[PDB]
Amino acid sequence: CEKIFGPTRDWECYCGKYKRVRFKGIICERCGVEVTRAKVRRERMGHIE
Amino acid sequence: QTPRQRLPVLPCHVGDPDLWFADTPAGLEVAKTLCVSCPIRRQCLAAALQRAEPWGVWGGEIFDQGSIVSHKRPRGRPRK
């Protein structure tokens, strides 16, 4: 889930609107993800309830 | 010590580039004569012809907004 474990491309939100480095740390209400690097898939934790 | 290509031989980029856009017909005459020693005046002149330059010295030749000039008239009344 990209909404939990970050995006899959560098500063690429999921719908595709925000694709610029001027956007940074901005969660996108349409797709759900926060714009950042794809390196955060190395160290973003999730939990099961 | 360089052993590079003919870029210092290339008299386009020897000095100041703004000289090549001189706002004085005399002031660009040195620029136009400087490409008399240019190895590549044919292809450069051809490229400037086909790309429809708006300005400047090109192939050892100035260009108007559309095409080739003999040489620009200066400010004032043209003579007889």
């Binding site: - | 010590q1 360089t2 052993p3 590079r4 290509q5 870029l7």
Partner: protein, 49 residues
């Protein structure tokens, strides 16, 4: 204190150093040109090396 070294190995070993030096001697004006010159093994690389 000395040891030998074959040139086809040492050229591969010292490749970024020789890239920097033969850019600084203007034998190749950019890094990609330096890399292609090293790959084609033009004779100036030994006197640089």
């Amino acid at each position: 204190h000395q040891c030998g070294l074959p040139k086809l190995m040492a050229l591969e070993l010292f490749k970024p150093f020789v890239m920097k030096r033969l850019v600084d001697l203007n034998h190749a004006q950019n890094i990609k040109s330096a890399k292609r010159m090293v790959e084609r093994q033009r004779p100036q690389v030994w006197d640089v090396l």
